[PDB]
Design an enzyme around this catalytic site. Sequence first.
Site, PDB file in Angstrom:
ATOM      1  N   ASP B  58       0.710  -1.410  -0.129  1.00 40.85           N
ATOM      2  CA  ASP B  58       0.049  -0.054  -0.040  1.00 40.85           C
ATOM      3  C   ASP B  58       0.829   1.537  -0.030  1.00 40.85           C
ATOM      4  OD1 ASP B  58      -2.402  -1.270   0.020  1.00 40.85           O
ATOM      5  OD2 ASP B  58      -2.380  -1.322   2.192  1.00 40.85           O
ATOM      6  N   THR B  91      -3.909   5.485  -3.561  1.00 42.58           N
ATOM      7  CA  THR B  91      -2.927   6.513  -2.836  1.00 42.58           C
ATOM      8  C   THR B  91      -1.496   6.438  -3.338  1.00 42.58           C
ATOM      9  OG1 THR B  91      -2.743   4.593  -1.128  1.00 42.58           O
ATOM     10  CG2 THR B  91      -4.277   6.445  -0.584  1.00 42.58           C
ATOM     11  N   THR B  92      -0.958   5.393  -3.809  1.00 43.57           N
ATOM     12  CA  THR B  92       0.152   5.210  -4.386  1.00 43.57           C
ATOM     13  C   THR B  92       0.372   6.286  -5.768  1.00 43.57           C
ATOM     14  OG1 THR B  92       1.052   3.260  -3.756  1.00 43.57           O
ATOM     15  CG2 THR B  92       1.979   4.318  -5.907  1.00 43.57           C
ATOM     16  N   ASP B 392      -9.135  -2.788   1.069  1.00 48.93           N
ATOM     17  CA  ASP B 392      -9.309  -2.024  -0.149  1.00 48.93           C
ATOM     18  C   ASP B 392     -10.091  -2.385  -1.246  1.00 48.93           C
ATOM     19  OD1 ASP B 392      -7.188  -0.230   0.931  1.00 48.93           O
ATOM     20  OD2 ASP B 392      -5.821  -0.805  -0.748  1.00 48.93           O
TER      21      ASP B 392
HETATM   22  N1  ADP Z   1      -3.709  -6.839 -14.906  1.00 45.31           N
HETATM   23  C1  ADP Z   1      -3.668  -5.380 -15.131  1.00 45.31           C
HETATM   24  N2  ADP Z   1      -3.243  -4.926 -16.214  1.00 45.31           N
HETATM   25  C2  ADP Z   1      -2.949  -3.887 -16.447  1.00 45.31           C
HETATM   26  N3  ADP Z   1      -3.273  -2.532 -15.760  1.00 45.31           N
HETATM   27  C3  ADP Z   1      -3.737  -3.205 -14.285  1.00 45.31           C
HETATM   28  C4  ADP Z   1      -3.780  -4.492 -13.997  1.00 45.31           C
HETATM   29  N4  ADP Z   1      -4.161  -4.449 -12.607  1.00 45.31           N
HETATM   30  C5  ADP Z   1      -4.007  -3.300 -12.487  1.00 45.31           C
HETATM   31  N5  ADP Z   1      -3.713  -2.196 -13.086  1.00 45.31           N
HETATM   32  C6  ADP Z   1      -3.464  -0.906 -13.215  1.00 45.31           C
HETATM   33  O1  ADP Z   1      -2.362  -0.434 -12.396  1.00 45.31           O
HETATM   34  C7  ADP Z   1      -2.943   0.264 -11.185  1.00 45.31           C
HETATM   35  C8  ADP Z   1      -2.609  -0.061  -9.929  1.00 45.31           C
HETATM   36  O2  ADP Z   1      -2.782   0.965  -9.267  1.00 45.31           O
HETATM   37  P1  ADP Z   1      -2.569   0.623  -7.373  1.00 45.31           P
HETATM   38  O3  ADP Z   1      -1.326   0.292  -7.094  1.00 45.31           O
HETATM   39  O4  ADP Z   1      -4.095   0.099  -7.161  1.00 45.31           O
HETATM   40  O5  ADP Z   1      -2.808   2.328  -6.838  1.00 45.31           O
HETATM   41  P2  ADP Z   1      -2.883   2.202  -5.268  1.00 45.31           P
HETATM   42  O6  ADP Z   1      -1.650   1.660  -4.791  1.00 45.31           O
HETATM   43  O7  ADP Z   1      -2.560   3.887  -5.241  1.00 45.31           O
HETATM   44  O8  ADP Z   1      -4.234   1.976  -4.830  1.00 45.31           O
HETATM   45  C9  ADP Z   1      -4.272   0.561 -11.465  1.00 45.31           C
HETATM   46  O9  ADP Z   1      -4.508   2.146 -11.921  1.00 45.31           O
HETATM   47  C10 ADP Z   1      -4.778  -0.352 -12.529  1.00 45.31           C
HETATM   48  O10 ADP Z   1      -5.562   0.335 -13.366  1.00 45.31           O
HETATM   49 MG    MG Z   2      -5.763  -0.343  -5.704  1.00 49.39          MG
END
Ligand code: ADP
Ligand code: MG
Lengths: 317, 526, 522, 39, 529
Positions: B58, B91-92, B392
């Site tokens: 996270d 949040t990242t 989450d």
């Molecule tokens: N299997 C996947 N293929 C392509 N993109 C993805 C996949 N899974 C997640 N993503 C993208 O990667 C990003 C991951 O963000 P995330 O790490 O959840 O942000 P945070 O940690 O702030 O919640 C998201 O914006 C999502 O659209």
């Molecule tokens: Mg997320």
Amino acid sequence: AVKTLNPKAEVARAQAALAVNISAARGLQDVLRTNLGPKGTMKMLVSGAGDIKLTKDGNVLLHEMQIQHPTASLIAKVATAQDDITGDGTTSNVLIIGELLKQADLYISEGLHPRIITEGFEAAKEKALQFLEEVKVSREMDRETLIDVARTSLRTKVHAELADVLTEAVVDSILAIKKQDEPIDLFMIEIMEMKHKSETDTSLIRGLVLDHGARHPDMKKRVEDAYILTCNVSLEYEKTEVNSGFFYKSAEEREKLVKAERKFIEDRVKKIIELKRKVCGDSDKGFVVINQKGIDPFSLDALSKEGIVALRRAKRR
Amino acid sequence: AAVKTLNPKAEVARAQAALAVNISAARGLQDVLRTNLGPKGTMKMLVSGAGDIKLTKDGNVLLHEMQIQHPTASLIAKVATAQDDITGDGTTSNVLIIGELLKQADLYISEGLHPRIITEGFEAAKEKALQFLEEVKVSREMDRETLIDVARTSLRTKVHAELADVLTEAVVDSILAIKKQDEPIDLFMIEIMEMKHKSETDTSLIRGLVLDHGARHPDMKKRVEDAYILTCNVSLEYEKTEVNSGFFYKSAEEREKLVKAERKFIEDRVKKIIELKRKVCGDSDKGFVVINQKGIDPFSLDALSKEGIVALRRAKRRNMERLTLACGGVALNSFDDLSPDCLGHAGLVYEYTLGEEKFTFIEKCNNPRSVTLLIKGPNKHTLTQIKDAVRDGLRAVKNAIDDGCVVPGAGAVEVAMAEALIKHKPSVKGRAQLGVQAFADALLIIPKVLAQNSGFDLQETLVKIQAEHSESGQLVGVDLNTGEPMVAAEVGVWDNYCVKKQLLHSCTVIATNILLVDEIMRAGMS
Amino acid sequence: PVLVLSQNTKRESGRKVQSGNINAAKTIADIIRTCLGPKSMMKMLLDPMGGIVMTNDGNAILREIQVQHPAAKSMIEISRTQDEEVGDGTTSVIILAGEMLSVAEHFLEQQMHPTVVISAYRKALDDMISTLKKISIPVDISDSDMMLNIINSSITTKAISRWSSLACNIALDAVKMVQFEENGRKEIDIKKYARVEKIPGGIIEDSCVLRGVMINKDVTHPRMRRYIKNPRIVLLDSSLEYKKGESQTDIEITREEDFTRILQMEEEYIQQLCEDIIQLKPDVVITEKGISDLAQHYLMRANITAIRRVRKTDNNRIARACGARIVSRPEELREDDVGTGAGLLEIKKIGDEYFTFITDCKDPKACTILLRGASKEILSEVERNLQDAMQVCRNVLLDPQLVPGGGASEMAVAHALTEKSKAMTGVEQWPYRAVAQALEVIPRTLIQNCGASTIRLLTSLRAKHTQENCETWGVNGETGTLVDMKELGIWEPLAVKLQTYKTAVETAVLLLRIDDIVSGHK
Amino acid sequence: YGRPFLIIKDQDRKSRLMGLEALKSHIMAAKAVANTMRT
Amino acid sequence: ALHVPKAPGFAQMLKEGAKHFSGLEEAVYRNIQACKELAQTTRTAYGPNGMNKMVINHLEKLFVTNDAATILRELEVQHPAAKMIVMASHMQEQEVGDGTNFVLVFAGALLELAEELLRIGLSVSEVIEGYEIACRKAHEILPNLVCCSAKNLRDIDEVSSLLRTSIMSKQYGNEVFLAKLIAQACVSIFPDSGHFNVDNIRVCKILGSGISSSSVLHGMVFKKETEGDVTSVKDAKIAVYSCPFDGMITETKGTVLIKTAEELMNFSKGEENLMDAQVKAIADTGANVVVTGGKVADMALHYANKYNIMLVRLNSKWDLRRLCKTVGATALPRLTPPVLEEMGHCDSVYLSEVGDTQVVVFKHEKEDGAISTIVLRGSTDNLMDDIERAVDDGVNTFKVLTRDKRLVPGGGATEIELAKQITSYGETCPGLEQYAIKKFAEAFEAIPRALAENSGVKANEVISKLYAVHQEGNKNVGLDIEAEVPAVKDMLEAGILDTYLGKYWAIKLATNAAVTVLRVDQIIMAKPA
Ligand SMILES: Nc1ncnc2c1ncn2[C@@H]1O[C@H](COP(=O)(O)OP(=O)(O)O)[C@@H](O)[C@H]1O
Ligand SMILES: [Mg+2]
Ligand SMILES: Nc1ncnc2c1ncn2[C@@H]1O[C@H](COP(=O)(O)OP(=O)(O)O)[C@@H](O)[C@H]1O
Ligand SMILES: Nc1ncnc2c1ncn2[C@@H]1O[C@H](COP(=O)(O)OP(=O)(O)O)[C@@H](O)[C@H]1O
Ligand SMILES: Nc1ncnc2c1ncn2[C@@H]1O[C@H](COP(=O)(O)OP(=O)(O)O)[C@@H](O)[C@H]1O
Ligand SMILES: [Mg+2]
Ligand SMILES: [Mg+2]
Ligand SMILES: [Mg+2]
């Protein structure tokens, strides 16, 4: 990974090394960019003793900056080498280093390797060399062009009126050169300092100014038509090299021995006196003796009684 | 110097200094946080002063547990924690977007430019981006499949494949069992219980509740099949008189009469329960369970055990509501009136002892309005990681339910929004339009890292992505296995509209506030 | 070792201290010089306790600055005075006070006794107040658009200017809602009855002023209703459980029917209290103190929603919003004390907390701003700007006069009292015209802030201002250009301007009166 | 004035006897010497 | 969030004690403030009513005086801009001998007004160029302000009157006496060839009676005692030697060899006879006084007493050469009784006591000589030091009067007239630079005001009166001293004048210092060690 071997060791790895180098170069560029061109601003620098140095040069300021960073020293000695060989172009050097580094880091932080950046830099340097070779204008170096170049440089260094007077003096100084094919020697154009009247009174003297004067009070203080005898012999008392020693038996012998010991330098000075009298003692034509080595007050008086002026302990140059 | 003359022990950073330090701190935070975004990110391992291990991915957990003290770091940290406490995800990307906005602003300011026009461009770009996001979302019906897709897109980001699949199934099944025709979605109704127990893939969903209590009396039954449930807030513990009581007797027999009289009140209170049980149903081993928020005396414990009654004491305050919505009974603060309508039903109530602790499972309900998620882990840090992932995922599903909309994922929306911003850039007048450009380039920080963490080059992948979108307006994003452009809707990578809106708002606002800073001060020490 | 005074006593006297005094003042005028005007720059302060305060206003800047020079303490005191009295003009008064002290330094150095400088300052203050009152433009209170324009003018120089057209309205509503009259007395008590509450996380334009009160409480029991249509609000001051009392009691029990009897009497007393509070058939009951379990049981039996311990200020706001009355003894609760007028009671969930709303009142005399944003510092700043707007609106409401902003009033009064000076004959003219030119700092600061050549721009401003009927000609700091405030539509309340001039001159006099300093003693 | 002024180098340790007390001390030391020499 | 980190870049790579000041408000204003402090620490010592100031140097030496250069040199200054102003004032003192306090006041005024202009909104370059234009205008109009050029430089009364106005700035009470002695000393050295030297006026400090007991003698006085037994030769022929009064020895080490008893007998007798012959040869030439630059042998001293030869030892080459100049002899390295052309002639030589200081006197009784000496009396060392400073200033005034004999009115007249002319020129000039020109009129106001500031009167009142009178055109009116009320009076008739060259150089150097210190906008101090 030397902290395992040397616990008291400082290590900056790939991204760390790039970041620290770019930051140091940016700092140097930001300090040095506030003076480039005639519109730059002076810098006042104070050392430990308290002496004041007003400067705008890249090399002088860069040396007198209180910095300890390694890459800062790297670019500092690059700049001082460039100053030593070419003469100027030091602040622009530092600015160019800073800008190359900033652009390279801008294109590397996007997920790129520096190798292709450096290859592009090499190709661009080759093309830039070709363009610079093809853009220069070749002319006959005359008075006007030299005034222009020196005026540019001095206008960069100092303000308008002083820059112009210095430009005239500098060109008139380095225009009395030998044969065209003979490379210029800049040791002959020597600089003399005088804490004296206003800064606009600096000028060019055709002959020489020497920091030494006539050491005997009775020597004349001005000679109009002067012969010059430049020498490197010592009219100073030169004792016997191999540990000699006088041995006598009465005060009369002592007096005879002091006369004998003076006789050698007396003869050497008499040679000069004979040369002067044979050349010209007439119509108030003065004689000047300029000696690199010392001259003893006995010989000072001997030369002074002949109406001569003698200069002792001059520089080799 | 100004302040340093008035306060000798003070810190002052001027305009260029303040900008430099702010952008440096933002770049440091972005460089640390960029390696966890996306399902292909790398977990971080954190150790506190005590020495406990915490594995995480996270942005909020890493950003709170990181050992930093920089001011702007704290500013963006609490921006992130507020964005987490409202939405629950993204949040990242918050700190990544902050870092990129600040980097581009520094890039355009170092050329000798005033930050005000950059912020004006930021405002114009934010407005245009908001309109584009409002006109790009897809409004569908939140069926089971869409919710599974959203939960998978979140949890597969949080954890590995099989665990993410199990948790998405559990989360969707739980959230579909709480929703009503209105839209309250009370996430408090979801117990999240932990067990240092069998493997991490054994976590699941229990229709009833799991209580960390048990039958204290040794002779109480450990498993009742069909149970009536009586949730209470009455104290079966002995309670002394409030107004300074005190006994006075003259003989041992008097003392015995006094102890009987002392017990009489609570004995009557428990007699009410026992008459209720016998009147309602005593036969056929139909069990009776009394669950009390307050304490139960050993006397009353033994009296109830003698009548085949299982009783739990010291239950949580929220468990009253959870049980009265799951078992269907009613919480009671007094025993003035007891009726059969005050009993909930349970289809199986039993007790499982783990190590030294005991748990009571209440399941096989007819229609639970409150379920529980039981997490099983071989160690504590796995349990905490699963808890964060579940939080989450539940927040993402709830945000999907709240508004009937969802945005394509995989960075497609950022690419399309940046392309639209570039197209709109000529319309906005003044040099501040270049600031809009910065904003557009800033958005590209999201898709780029998706390639960066996957091992592919940033430039080639980004140009391939933007050429596909320019050629055809189809919303294409990064494919983390190949790098070619893949349509987000076709593959199912969904993202929350509220999360993206909150990013576009908070990131721009805090970046604008930071850019306007021209003096960082530390004074106030005597 | 004989000492007339203590060992820690230090004496400083003569011109030096005077100079030092002036210097200290100017130093504070040097800190907040760049935070004035629509093009102000944010300033970030590190709290000694570990927080961060990102502001522009002078008082919120000088509150976190610790200074050891006493003149600096007096400057901080005048900043706090300006904040507390009228709520606006803090940087303005600090800048003016500092620069008048600086311009008095010249006459101090030229062997001129400070008493004549003080007298000239007093005369200049009287004349400047008079000519500032002369050029006032009356405002119409009922005109909502004019008040919106005034608040927008007051707020365009700060952070929330981007959402000005929203936030402005909010302020107006609050200042038009706390407005109250009772026994021939008008209050507009923003401090106690217009609460501003910040919840991090959300959108700036989601914030709004409520027709009621929102507080961070939740129903005591799960089964109490979380949605009421037309609640009959009753407020309680006392508690609803059994308490020991005051006098020592020490009851003595000998019979076998006294312990259970005592407990049954306690329960009977609670039941009597609950039945007596139910007798008026309310719907939601609010109490400052606790609720016993049996008491809320009896309240549930009559379908009543009860809220546990609530702060006294929140209860006062609820009473003012619903028209109810806080009571302590439920035995003495009448019908007129039951609050009819609340139109909705919502137990909503925000983030991970439960918030209760008593919104949609008939004519509430107390409001609450649900202020939603992105972070605690951002909401704190928006809170400060909202307070600024409320203070400005209240000043306009209590005083129907206005005066042009942007530097037009400063130059106007300067020119007027300079023309007055050019007639009087005496030695006091020089400090008088020194104050006249002293007020020129505000246009100069605005021009320096917007980034324009202040010399010829300010000279042209003065020249254009010499022409008659041009006292509204000021400088536009958005682009740094000579404009007319009538067409730019910027006017500040006369109260703020006159208060600023008064306190600036007064504190300049105070710091100019002092020539000795004794430091160190207990 | 409040400021105590210093005129003599290292004057915080020097001792001074003046007036009739100094003469008393002189006479006392002389008496001690005479009493020692009397026996 | 409890510690602000150092800004990356230069601020993070600085050294420990290094201090970097950048920007206008952080460097230029601080330099202006420091220079104003330096100017005001000495402003109170300006004019004929300037109070003397006492300074204890780092070696605990008392200096009581109001000479700005002396108190500025013997007071440690650590600020760079103040060091700049110190250098400018010291160069002014070296070039002319007066104007150092004028340089301080003018530089401080220029920097204060430049700070005011920079606050108003002018640029650094605009103020610098305006200052240079105004300085050139002042230099262009200065020669038209002169009056009463020095005529003779030989008459006692006229030169005494000319120097009295340069003396009143110190010791305002005893003015005519010091001027009379300085004039008497100076005229006797003017070699009627135009090259008047200031190192031929020596001062001899003798403790004792008051100032009124001072005197000038056309010779020298040495604080020495004759090594012989004969004193007070009447009309002596002096022989001057640069070698010790001893049998000269080999520079190389020489040890005598005696191999027979006869040589051991004859060695001492022969040495004694040789020394006697040498002394007799020196004495028979009519010489009565022998002065040597080294040690005197006991046997040589004996033979000096025998032939009645006064023998005065000297222990300084400067003293030896000055004695040679004043008597007309020349030092010769051997004994070699001098030929007729190098025998000094003096009217008398004495060994005299005046203040328990036995001294040797080479007094001439015909006013002739290239060196004259002031024997000034006093009651304290510090008071005689102040009188000696005044004599040095008067001698330097005479020296700068030998060339460029033009004079300008004093007492604030010249400064006020120059300010009026320069402000008229500024008002008759367009452009943005004119403001700087209008500041010189204020800068030249600093000088007369200071005078009034030290006279116990109102500076504003006297300035207003000065402009009111000068508007008519009588350019020769200035501040009156000791009138108990701010008043003005003529300076051409009062004899209160200053050398044109001195004011020229003072204005030039003050403007140069102010412009140079204004030019710099970045300071890097480096760890004061
Ligand atoms: N299997 C996947 N293929 C392509 N993109 C993805 C996949 N899974 C997640 N993503 C993208 O990667 C990003 C991951 O963000 P995330 O790490 O959840 O942000 P945070 O940690 O702030 O919640 C998201 O914006 C999502 O659209
Ligand atoms: Mg997320
Ligand atoms: N009068 C002028 N007008 C415009 N540009 C100039 C003028 N004089 C010099 N320059 C440019 O300004 C630059 C000054 O560089 P300079 O400060 O001398 O570099 P460095 O200090 O490294 O020698 C030169 O590159 C020159 O081309
Ligand atoms: N758009 C504008 N252009 C020029 N001046 C303005 C503008 N808006 C406000 N001002 C001026 O700025 C001043 C208010 O600035 P502000 O930052 O509120 O300072 P303070 O906190 O001291 O009131 C007012 O005197 C007003 O005249
Ligand atoms: N009798 C007098 N009346 C009025 N002014 C005088 C009189 N004598 C001297 N002055 C003025 O007092 C000033 C003394 O300055 P001074 O201390 O000599 O400066 P500095 O120390 O730089 O040489 C001179 O400028 C002169 O004009
Ligand atoms: Mg150059
Ligand atoms: Mg305001
Ligand atoms: Mg003087």
